[PDB]
């Protein structure tokens, strides 16, 4: 509530790494990389459409999870919840490290292990508290931090004056196999949608504001990306093998003049902590939506949510079991698996806008039937282009979820179609 | 129909590689390997229980797929069908290669590429025809071939006289047994043969649950009374079999001389399981077809199985793997389908709980535990299976889902629907 603070969240929850994204992508060239932002933005825009439409037909508590529930039943709803709930706070631990690693990286306040681990846990509860007492208040905070974090990116254009960069300086491979290696970066840079969908229930004035923020935030972060990754791969820190090594930041203050004292990392650190609260917000939301139904422990619904702390207690437990102990083999990899979890809800939501809203089409049916087919292929490629290892455990999680469900809802479950009786 | 020909199928569809299994497992030792057959047989027996019970409460067309349908709805039923249907015939192409590769390997009739590829396609339709006109006739064939194939294994015990053979890669006893499961967990992908065989099978609700436990307990004895009767003492030490595929090695340290009649029947015990799987292929296809899920053609007039659509595909995917250059990508697929088979296994367990939570006894905790083992069983099997493979199993679910929401858009029955 209302619209303008939400449209910033939908975009903010995407750009928790918009400032650093460029260099990591410049490795696989940056000239024929823009020749790849299309495939990404097109597919990603198709997803923003689906969620925008699905939310206009049903402003839910809600999902995602909600849409999944209706579409496929209780099982896949319950499942959609867990996966997404985990991806929310498990994805948060990597955001504090990098978040704080932007404040104490340029001063440099403090750096050592047991020193940074405490200020992260500290700032975590700093946002866990803002959520448990101010849905409007937390949306204010993010709205503030995301605008600050945008100052640089929006300030970068300001184009003068690009200089023919490496164009296609990526590893020797056909233009097709070259763009494929660029998607491994761009496809995952739009895991910010559905922020309004689950934000519904709150958000207020939904059915309109949500679908608007869903397309707004995306079209905002879509411009930022292609009007930032271009305004740097030409001409500030070229050639490719100049940024390909060092993390961007102070490199934007030489080839057009800013001096420094770099005030860049001072706000690009808030644009990572501002997205902290937003995700914990969603965490408790999907948890409540589920809790309010026969699926997922009741405590997560108790006026915002009181069990918002169970997320905080866990985020801290999984903060210590990754920083202090040396390995870390498990804490380290788990943080990347949760990212794939986020793709399962994305999937079903599409299947939902079809299976459910096959009536409210227009019938501009083929047009809708196609947009959902793109968003489908989008999510599919994202998965494929993601090192085997990671995916393997996403699967094993489904494996567990399933068993975990049939062992907790044994009799509470409503079977279609049931047995006979004798 | 009736029982005795089916109990042999449930076991036959497990031992399509029971004769070769030993050596591949001897690599990771064979002494502390028996100290691993327990974990396997226990978990695998737990699965045979679930299916035996689930089928006694509902003799279905059927699944698996069927149980999955009731349990979770139409979507997961439809999905359970595809995955299992594919795993049936995609798993068949590797059975003809190895099957024929047991006849023309010891004579040796013929060996070359475009020569073996033709006799496989030939023997494929040889079983595709036996199925499209004789469910009893095909069960006769397998019943015959599986008994023949058992002659060696059952004849191996005959124990005299074992000789003291953990020679696996340096690793704690726990990490040593884990590497043994990568062989044993997957050696029991033969269950649920009777469950899907229901509808046919006749006299079900009893015969099926009996064959489900019978076949397993039969192939469970064969394994542990064969892998032991060889890792002691015929071809030891470990690094004697660890290199060469067993077969003629069982005719020196106790047995008769040349002319090995072993590979002559152990080739039929691989072709006899050919028809059985195509049988199930058309069965799960029909069961699904007979419901709103899966193309209608797979259910027709003739009182048996569109059983040819499977044959047409098995041939297309036979050529696109032997004659053609590449040629590896379409070879990985043959191993992915194996994991597909684990998804039905999963839901079936979830079913015997979610559905049959009444007919328990209530010996509830006892049932509630058996299903928990079979659960963990299927879970480990998946984990202990090189990332790559699993990744594409997931991508298949990805596709299946989209494939469904794009074909049953309006036919789908939504719980709970929208509004106005």
């Amino acid at each position: 509530v209302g619209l303008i603070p939400v449209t910033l969240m939908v975009s903010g929850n995407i750009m928790g790494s918009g400032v650093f994204l460029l260099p990591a992508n410049l490795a696989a060239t940056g000239g024929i990389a823009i020749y790849g932002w299309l495939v990404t933005i097109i597919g990603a825009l198709a997803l923003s459409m689906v969620y925008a439409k699905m939310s206009s037909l049903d402003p839910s508590p809600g999902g995602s999870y909600a849409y999944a529930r209706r579409c496929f039943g209780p099982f896949l709803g319950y499942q959609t919840n867990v996966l997404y709930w985990l991806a929310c706070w498990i994805g948060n631990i990597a955001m504090v490290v990098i978040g704080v690693g932007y404040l104490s990286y340029f001063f440099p306040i403090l750096k050592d292990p047991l020193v940074l681990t405490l200020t992260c846990v500290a700032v975590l509860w700093i946002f866990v508290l803002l959520n448990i007492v101010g849905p409007k208040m937390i949306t204010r905070v993010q709205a503030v931090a995301t605008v600050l974090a945008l100052v640089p990116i929006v300030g970068i254009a300001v184009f003068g004056w690009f200089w023919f960069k490496g164009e296609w300086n990526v590893s020797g491979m056909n233009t097709f196999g070259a763009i494929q290696s660029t998607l491994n970066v761009t496809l995952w840079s739009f895991i910010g949608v559905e922020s309004a969908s689950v934000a519904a229930g709150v958000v207020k004035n939904p059915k309109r504001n949500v679908p608007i923020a869903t397309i707004g935030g995306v079209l905002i972060a879509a411009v930022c990306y292609v009007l930032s990754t271009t305004a740097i791969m030409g001409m500030i820190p070229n050639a490719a093998l100049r940024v390909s090594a060092s993390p961007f930041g102070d490199a934007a203050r030489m080839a057009l003049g800013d001096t420094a004292g770099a005030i860049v990392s001072f706000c690009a650190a808030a644009g990572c902590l501002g997205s902290l609260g937003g995700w914990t917000l969603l965490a408790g939301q999907t948890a409540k939506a589920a809790a309010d139904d026969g699926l997922f422990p009741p405590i997560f619904a108790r006026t915002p949510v009181a069990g918002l702390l169970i997320v905080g207690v866990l985020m801290t437990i999984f903060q210590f079991s990754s920083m202090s102990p040396n390995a870390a083999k498990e804490f380290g990899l788990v943080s990347s698996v949760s990212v794939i979890f986020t793709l399962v809800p994305y999937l079903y939501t599409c299947a939902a806008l079809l299976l459910l809203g096959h009536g409210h089409f227009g019938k501009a049916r083929p047009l809708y039937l196609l947009i959902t087919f793109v968003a489908f292929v989008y999510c599919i490629w994202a998965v494929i282009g993601s090192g085997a290892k990671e995916v393997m455990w996403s699967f094993v999680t489904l494996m567990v979820i399933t068993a975990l469900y049939a062992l907790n809802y044994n009799r509470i479950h409503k079977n279609p179609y049931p047995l006979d009786a004798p | 129909v009736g029982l005795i020909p089916v109990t042999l199928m449930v076991s036959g569809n497990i031992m399509g590689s029971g004769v070769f299994l030993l050596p591949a497992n001897l690599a990771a030792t064979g002494g502390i390997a028996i100290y691993g057959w327990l974990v396997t047989i226990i978990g695998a027996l737990a699965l045979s229980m679930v299916y035996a019970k689930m089928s006694s409460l509902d003799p279905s067309p059927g699944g698996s797929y069927a149980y999955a349908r009731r349990c979770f709805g139409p979507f997961l039923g439809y999905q359970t069908n595809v995955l299992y249907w594919l795993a049936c015939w995609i798993g068949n192409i590797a059975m003809v290669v190895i099957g024929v590769g047991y006849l023309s390997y010891f004579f040796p009739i013929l060996k070359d590429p475009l020569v073996l590829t033709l006799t496989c396609v030939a023997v494929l339709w040889i079983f595709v025809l036996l199925n499209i006109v004789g469910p009893k006739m095909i069960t006769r064939v397998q019943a015959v071939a599986t008994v023949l194939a058992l002659v060696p294994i059952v004849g191996i015990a005959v124990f005299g006289w074992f000789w003291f053979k953990w020679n696996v890669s340096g690793m704690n006893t726990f990490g040593a047994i884990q590497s043994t499961l990568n062989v044993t967990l997957w050696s029991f992908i033969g269950v649920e043969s009777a469950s899907v065989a229901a509808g046919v099978v006749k006299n079900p609700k009893r015969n099926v649950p009996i064959a489900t436990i019978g076949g397993v307990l039969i192939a469970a004895v064969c394994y542990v009374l064969s892998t032991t009767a060889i890792m002691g003492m015929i071809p030891n030490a470990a690094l004697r079999v660890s290199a060469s595929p067993f077969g003629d090695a069982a005719r020196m340290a106790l047995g008769d001389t040349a002319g090995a009649i072993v590979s002559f029947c152990a080739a039929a015990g691989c072709l006899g399981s050919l028809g059985g799987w195509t049988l199930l292929a058309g069965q799960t296809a029909k069961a699904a077809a007979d419901d709103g899920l899966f193309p209608p053609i797979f259910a027709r007039v003739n009182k048996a199985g569109g059983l040819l659509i499977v044959g047409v595909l098995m041939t297309i995917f036979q050529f696109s793997s032997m004659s053609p250059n590449a040629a590896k990508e379409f070879g990985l697929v043959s191993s992915v389908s194996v994991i597909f088979t684990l998804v039905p296994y999963l839901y079936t367990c979830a079913a015997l709980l979610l559905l049959g939570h009444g007919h328990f006894g209530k010996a509830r905790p006892l049932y509630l535990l058996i299903t928990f083992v079979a659960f963990v069983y299927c879970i480990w099997a998946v984990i202990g299976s090189g990332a790559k493979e699993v990744m594409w199993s997931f991508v298949t679910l990805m596709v299946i889902t989209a494939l469904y929401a794009l074909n049953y858009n309006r036919i789908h029955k939504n719980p709970y629907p929208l509004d106005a």
Partner: antibody
Amino acid sequence: QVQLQQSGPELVKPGALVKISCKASGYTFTNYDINWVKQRPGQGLEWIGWIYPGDGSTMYNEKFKGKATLTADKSSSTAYMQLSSLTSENSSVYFCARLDGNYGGWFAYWGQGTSVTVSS
Amino acid sequence: ELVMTQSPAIMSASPGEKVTMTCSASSSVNYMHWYQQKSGTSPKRWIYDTSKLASGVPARFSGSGSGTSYSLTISSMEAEDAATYYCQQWSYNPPTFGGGTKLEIKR
């Protein structure tokens, strides 16, 4: 609001068959099932079967045959025949009913009821 | 073939009195449903998922139970409450209803 209302008639002669209708409105006819229950003279109600306007249908075992549930998507209603009626099988007002979902398991909307006498 | 056999068959109560009708069950089920049929007319949804109140149903009503024993109750009786209440299940096949409990007002 769901309406789901039916027809008042009619009397029947033993042996002959009847065809009762239930025209639904207020919701999309093809999103849910359509159920039928048979309530003897101020007595217990007996489920009969459902029918999916989408396609197929399930029928109560006891009343094997003796009735065929049909439907037309167009008219947004659903027919229902009683095959081999007999003097005693006389309604027992017949009700059409739609669940609130679907799947499982309680009827949220009932037809007004159709009284059926089968005498000569 | 899952019998409902609910009792009492017929009962009467004065306005303000606590009414309690039960519903046995052949074998254990999860969830039971109650409908309120007045004078032969089309039944009305009242108690779904064992303890859920329908749209209009007044707070005065309430349901409970599990396994084989379920029961519908009302704190204070009312003239309106007079009717026949039907317990019903869908936990197995086919779905079935009870004999009905006939509640009459006392005057």
